[PDB]
Amino acid sequence: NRWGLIGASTIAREWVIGAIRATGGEVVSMMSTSAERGAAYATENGIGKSVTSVEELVGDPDVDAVYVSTTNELHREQTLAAIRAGKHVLCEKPLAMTLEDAREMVVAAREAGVVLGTNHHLRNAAAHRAMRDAIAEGRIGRPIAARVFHAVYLPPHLQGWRLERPEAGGGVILDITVHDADTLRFVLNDDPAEAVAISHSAGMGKEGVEDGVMGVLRFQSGVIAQFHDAFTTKFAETGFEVHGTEGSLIGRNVMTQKPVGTVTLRNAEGESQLPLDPANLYETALAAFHSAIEGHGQPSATGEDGVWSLATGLAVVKAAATGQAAEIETGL
């Protein structure tokens, strides 16, 4: 029920603070490296305390759970503080910057007996759940190939850290390709095995920073999945498709943060749009996380889910950089 925010972020402002409130919880405090900004942002968003120390946020006895949506080089040490305080943690993706860090987070949560969740939103969407369901109900026969299109335009207000400092987590692979990875795993119900990729810097990424990637994952089942992730492409709709021996599912406009997009089943009979019962992706994420901390079930995406999606993003990074296929090994 009662949250502390770490990070005065656009993600919490735009989506997660309201989803916490919509689903029965409260944000009692938050923490920013800036006294000035924290306090303005706490006022802007109806939060009663702001604080410039992590331990003050995390050791706040009125705080039950913590949301980490700081930049990526801070996810680990902050989520480890919350756990050491005995607070459950929803951490933003990518769960961390290295696999050893991500694994430590998952092992620390387990040993303290608190819930650790990665905020993969997409897997919450009715579109993706309906595709997961459709494949498990045989609607396409056996899956052969998937295709993910996540080439977007990074809006001017976000053209900051994402496009600089790859040492601090920027680049489109860590930011976006992690979502594709997790969404593939969710929908296909299967785990990737290796990646090949080619990345570029097509005018947005500063320095050695990629702003588009294309690649292919081999899944344990044998299915091959292509992805295109990009910050630079304004007029490319998003999409997620699975092609089977008896049907194709064609998701259009389904990779965004909003709860929109259609899913079309094509088979021998024709085409139709699968019926969707949509809801705000982060209200669903948060309702699940709230249930998890109450003892009922897991968060939508678990800390291990974020280890997998990171494992896949780092393979993709490696394959783009060396030109060599890269096995996805989580170490779990």
Ligand X SMILES: NC(=O)C1=CN([C@@H]2O[C@H](COP(=O)(O)OP(=O)(O)OC[C@H]3O[C@@H](n4cnc5c(N)ncnc54)[C@H](OP(=O)(O)O)[C@@H]3O)[C@@H](O)[C@H]2O)C=CC1
Among 34, 43, 53, 98, the residue binding ligand X under the rule CB under 6 A is 34
Closest contact distance (angstroms) between CB of 135 and ligand X is 24
Buried-exposed string 1-14: b where 16+ CB fall within 10 A, e elsewhere: ebbbbbbbbebbee
**112, two tokens:** 């303290």
Site size toward ligand X, by CB under 6 A: 22
282 is in an annotated binding site: yes
Task: Give 50-92 as a DSSP string.
Answer: -BS-HHHHHT-TT--EEEE-S-TTSHHHHHHHHHHTT-EEEEP
Indicate the residue among 274 and 317 with the shorter CB distance to ligand X: 317
Q: Which of residues 77-96 bind ligand X (CB under 6 A)?
A: 92-93
Among 3, 4, 9, 163, the residue binding ligand X under the rule CB under 6 A is 9
User: Residue 277 is which amino acid?
Assistant: D
290 is in an annotated binding site: no
Q: Interface with ligand X by CB under 6 A: which range of 6-14, 105-113, 236-244, 312-320?
A: 6-14
Alpha helix stretches (DSSP H) within the chain: 10-11, 17-22, 35-44, 54-58, 75-84, 99-112, 126-136, 172, 178-188, 281-293, 303-322
Among 37, 110, 165, 266, the residue binding ligand X under the rule CB under 6 A is 37
Q: Which of residues 147-206 bind ligand X (CB under 6 A)?
A: 158, 160-161, 175
Q: Interface with ligand X by CB under 6 A: which range of 63-71, 96-104, 210-218, 289-297?
A: 63-71
Residue 270 φ/ψ region, left for φ over 0, alpha for ψ in the -120 to 50 degree band, beta for the rest: left
Start-to-end C-alpha separation, the chain: 30
Peptide bond into 278 cis (omega under 30): no
Indicate the residue among 14 and 246 with the shorter CB distance to ligand X: 14
Q: What residues have CB less than 8 Å from 162, skipping those under 6 apart?
A: 154, 170, 171, 172, 175, 231
Report residue 37 CA to chain centroid gap: 26
Closest contact distance (angstroms) between CB of 137 and ligand X is 28
Among 119, 177, 300, 302, the residue binding ligand X under the rule CB under 6 A is 119
Site string for ligand X, 248-277 (x = CB under 6 A): ---------x--------------------
Residues of each annotated binding site for NADP(+): 8-11, 32-33, 37, 70-75, 92-93, 119, 161-162, 282
State the residues that interact with ligand X by CB under 6 A.
7-11, 32-34, 37, 69-72, 92-93, 119, 121, 158, 160-161, 175, 257
